Design a protein around this ligand. Sequence first.
Ligand SMILES: [Cl-]
Ligand SMILES: [Cl-]
Ligand SMILES: [Cl-]
Ligand SMILES: [Cl-]
Lengths: 260, 260
Amino acid sequence: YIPGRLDGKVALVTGSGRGIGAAVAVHLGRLGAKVVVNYANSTKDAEKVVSEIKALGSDAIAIKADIRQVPEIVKLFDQAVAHFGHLDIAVSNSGVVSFGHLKDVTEEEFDRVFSLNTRGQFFVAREAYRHLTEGGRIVLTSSNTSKDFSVPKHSLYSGSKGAVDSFVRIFSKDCGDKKITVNAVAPGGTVTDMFHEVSHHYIPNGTSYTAEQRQQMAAHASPLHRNGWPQDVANVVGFLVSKEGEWVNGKVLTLDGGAA
Amino acid sequence: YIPGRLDGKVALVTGSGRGIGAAVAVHLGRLGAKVVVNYANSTKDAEKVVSEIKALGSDAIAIKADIRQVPEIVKLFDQAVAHFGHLDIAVSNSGVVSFGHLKDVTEEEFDRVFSLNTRGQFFVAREAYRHLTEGGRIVLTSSNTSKDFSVPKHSLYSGSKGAVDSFVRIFSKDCGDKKITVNAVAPGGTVTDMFHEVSHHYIPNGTSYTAEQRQQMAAHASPLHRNGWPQDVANVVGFLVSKEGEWVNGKVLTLDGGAA
Ligand SMILES: [Cl-]
Ligand SMILES: [Cl-]
Ligand SMILES: [Cl-]
Ligand SMILES: [Cl-]
C-alpha cells in the first residue's frame, strides 16, 4: 500500500466534460484509480479524458448520462459496477450556473438549476450509496456562494448549493452504515474556458472591465494572489477520497485560496 | 407611532392552517396589522384565524393558495393587494416534513418536499418582492435541521431548508432596491398537534419512548427546560417585521431556546 494513492480502487466522476470534472478524473487516475468518466454532452471530449488516464497507466471508460434523469443515474452506476466489478468512489462535478435578480427568475430557470445542481446531485449520492463498496467515498460539489460569498443576482444558484451543504452533513449519518464518508467541495473563482463568459457577474460593474482585468481581480481576491484552477479542486478531492481523508466526513470544504 | 407595532401595515402569512403560521397570523394582527390569512387546505380552520384577528380589533381575510403552483402565488398576492390596497409584510410558514434514509428516497418524495419547502418559498419571496411597498419585510421558514441540528434519515428536509438559508442572504441584496429586508426563522422543536406524530424521528430509539417522554426530552434539549411553542416563533417574526428589526437583514435566526 502506498499512502495517498488509490491503487486497486474504482472511481466514478461526473461532469468530466468541463474543466474541474476533467481535472478530477485525470487526477484520480494519476493516483491509481480506474475511472468511469461520466459526462453530459461531448463524447469526443470525454474520450480525450479517458485517453489521458490510460496514458498515465490507469484504466478508464466513458459512460454518458443525463444526471437530470434519475433512471439514467441508476443505469450509469449499474454499468460502472458491471464494467469494473465494483465501485469505491463517486465524485459529482455536475451543475450549471445561473444569474438574475429574484424579480425575474422564472419557473423554468428555477427547475433548470435545481434539477441538476440539487436534485441530480442528491440522486448521484443515492445511487453511490446503493452501489458502493464498504469504506467508500462520496464527494459532491457545493460553491463558495452557498455560504461564504454573497453575489447579488445569484440567489437561485446560491440556494441550489446551500441544499448540497446540508445534504452532505446528513448523508454522512446515513452512509456511515456502509462506512462511506460524504463530503462536499465548495470552490471559489476557478479559471476554465467558461470563466470569462461569467466573470463579470461576480464583481460590481463587472462589464466595465476587460476579461483580463476581471481575471486579475479574481486572482487578487485570494491572499496568495493567484487564480484558482481545476487542479486545486482535484488536489483536495484526491485527499478526501483517500484512506488518509477518512476523518473528514460530513463536511463542506471551501476551496478559494483564502479569499473568504 | 407606537414602537414595535404594525399599525397601518398589511401582512400576508402563508401556512396559517397549522400551529406556527396560525400563531404568526394572529400575532401580526395583535400588533396592529391587517392580515391576509393564506392557507393550503381547511377553509373553516382559516376562517377561525380570521375571526380571532377580527376579535382583536384588526381586519383579516382568508385567501387560499396551493403554494406549489406559482400561478396561484401570483394570484394570491394580486388578490391581497386588491383587497387591502397594498402589502408591506410577507411571511411564509409553508412546508412539509419528510423522513427516510437516503437509500430509500424516491423521485416523488424529493419533488413533494422541494416543490413546497424550497421552490414554493422561493416564489413566495419573488411575488412578495414584486408586490411589496418600499420598506417592507419578507420572512421565510428554514429549520434548526438546516445547519444546527443533525438528524439521521432527514437529509431531504434538511437540504430543502439549507437552500432557504442561502436564498435569504442573497434575496436581501436584490430586495434592497425596494428597501425590503429578507430573513428566515429556523425553529427547533415546536409543539403543535402534529409534533407527537413525528417526534420519535428526532431522538435515537424514539419509538421506545411514550409521546409524553418524547415531549419532555424535547423540553430538556433547551437549557430553559421547556418546549418551544408557535408563539415563540411568532414573537420573533413580529420583531423582524417591525421598524425596529430593520438592521437584521439577510439572516437566519435559529429559534430553539438555546438547544444548539
Ligand atoms: Cl460533462
Ligand atoms: Cl452532469
Ligand atoms: Cl395551511
Ligand atoms: Cl402552504
